[PDB]
Structure 1
Amino acid sequence: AAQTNAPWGLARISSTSPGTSTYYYDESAGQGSCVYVIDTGIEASHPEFEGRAQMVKTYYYSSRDGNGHGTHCAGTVGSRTYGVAKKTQLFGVKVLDDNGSGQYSTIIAGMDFVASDKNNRNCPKGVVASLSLGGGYSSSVNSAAARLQSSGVMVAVAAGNNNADARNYSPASEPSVCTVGASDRYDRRSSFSNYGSVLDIFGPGTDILSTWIGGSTRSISGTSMATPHVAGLAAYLMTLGKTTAASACRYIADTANKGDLSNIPFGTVNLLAYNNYQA
């Protein structure tokens, strides 16, 4: 399938070169997979989600996304226009308040929730969790992410936005999950992207158009935007049968575009997520 006039990041993940604007992908499109978006919520009524999104858990007075961040990230995973995996099922877990803030204890509870809740969902092709959040190093936060991964969920986490080594942030620094840095449309490391040995992969993160609350759209930047590209890619590849939740991060690294990003510090991987789709 070909989506013309796609957001640059979608075109990038199906291309061997920057500077194109059509997204190419197998029509299976993540059907039969599920992606949990652990964030500020999801505006599931947005027409872009086509009934495929739902809130399953909140720790606050509402499950609605009063911020926009979680809706944007969910749109990059799986919205019809802005999403990588256009037929996946999206499940929202609201661990962040409407200002985008949340306590680590709530975030940990949300991760353990997903590890169990997947057993209440129909995801025959596999389960992914996208975590566009983080803070300072916490062994307990890292352990929660490791448990979620161990339970059979492909965990993708944002590297962070400090232009610093991600070893000092969680869950970014957990070795067993997929830690995602951000790139721009010219294949440069995004100016804010964290780096370091703990990164596994880069995805599009600067000037990313996606869904927003109020049935709207907007372009924003962050490792939060790169992470759902990778989460959606994992769901797409799992539906194709090319990999599994346990192996998807490594498979994405194996099959990435290699050596194409600029301003990658010595010792950080130079790997850009790529779907290797041939029409």
Structure 2
Amino acid sequence: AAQTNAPWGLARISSTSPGTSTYYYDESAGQGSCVYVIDTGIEASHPEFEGRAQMVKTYYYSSRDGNGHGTHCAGTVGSRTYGVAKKTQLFGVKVLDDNGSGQYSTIIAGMDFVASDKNNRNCPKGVVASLSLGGGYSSSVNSAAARLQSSGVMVAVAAGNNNADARNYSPASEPSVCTVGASDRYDRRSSFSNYGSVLDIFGPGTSILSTWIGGSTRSISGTSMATPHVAGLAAYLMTLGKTTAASACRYIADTANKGDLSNIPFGTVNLLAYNNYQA
């Protein structure tokens, strides 16, 4: 399949070169997979989700995304126009309030929720979780992310936007999950992107167009935007039978565009998520 005039990040993920604008992907498009977006929620009524999104959990007075950030991330995972895996099922878990904040205890509860909740969902091709959030180092937060991964979920987490070594942030610093840095349309490390040994992969993170609340669309930047590209990619690859939850991060790294990013600090992987789709 070919989507012309796609957001640059989608085009990037199916290309051996920067500077193109068509997204190429296998028509299966993540059908039969599921992606949990653990964030401020998802506006499920957005036409871009085509009925494939639903809220499954909140820790607040409402499951509504009153912020937009969760809706944007969900859009990059799986919206019809702005998404990597255009036929995946999206499940929203609202661990962040409408200000985009959340106590670590609530975030941890949300991760353990997903590990159980997948047993209540139909995801024959596999399960992914996208965590576009984080804070300072916490062994408890890392351990929760590790449990989620261990339970059979491909966990993708944001590296963070501190232009610093991600070893000092959680869940970014958890070794067993897939930690995602951000790049721009010119294959530069995004200026805010964290880096370091704990990073596993980079994805498009600067100036990313996706869904927003009120049935709208929006371009924003962050490792929060890179993460759902990788989560959607994992779901897409799992539907193709190319990988599994336990090995998707490794597979994505194995098959990534290598050595093509600029301003990657010595000791950080120079790997850019790539679907290796040959039309």
1:21-60 pair list within 5 angstroms: 21-60=21-60
Moved over 6 A (4+): none
Whole-Å separation in 2 of the counterparts to 1:74 and 1:208: 12
Normalised by the size of structure 1, how large is the TM-score?
1.00
Residue aligned with 1:142, SS? helix
Structure 1's unaligned 5+ residue stretches are none
* Structure 2 equivalent of residue 163 of structure 1: 163
Aligned residues: 279
* Structure 2 equivalent of residue 265 of structure 1: 265
Whole-Å separation in 1 of the counterparts to 2:187 and 2:5: 19
Whole-Å separation in 2 of the counterparts to 1:68 and 1:218: 9
Residue aligned with 1:16, SS? coil
* Structure 1 equivalent of residue 11 of structure 2: 11
Residue aligned with 2:92, SS? strand
Deviation at 1:101, TM superposition (A): 0.1
Whole-Å separation in 1 of the counterparts to 2:61 and 2:22: 41
Q: CA RMSD in A?
A: 0.1
Deviation at 1:263, TM superposition (A): 0.1
Deviation at 1:260, TM superposition (A): 0.1
Whole-Å separation in 2 of the counterparts to 1:102 and 1:249: 26
What do residues 113-169 of structure 1 show as CA deviations (whole Å, max 9, x unaligned)?
000000000000000000000000000000000000000000000000000000000
Deviation at 1:103, TM superposition (A): 0.1
Deviation at 1:99, TM superposition (A): 0.2
Residue aligned with 1:190, SS? coil
Residue aligned with 1:182, SS? strand
- Percentage of pairs with the same residue: 100
Deviation at 1:211, TM superposition (A): 0.1
Structure 2's unaligned 5+ residue stretches are none
Whole-Å separation in 2 of the counterparts to 1:243 and 1:230: 13
Residue aligned with 1:48, SS? helix
Deviation at 1:199, TM superposition (A): 0.1
Whole-Å separation in 2 of the counterparts to 1:43 and 1:30: 20
Residue aligned with 2:90, SS? strand
Deviation at 1:250, TM superposition (A): 0.2
Deviation at 1:242, TM superposition (A): 0.1
Residue aligned with 2:230, SS? helix
Deviation at 1:109, TM superposition (A): 0.1
Whole-Å separation in 1 of the counterparts to 2:278 and 2:216: 32
Whole-Å separation in 1 of the counterparts to 2:147 and 2:102: 20
Whole-Å separation in 2 of the counterparts to 1:241 and 1:260: 27
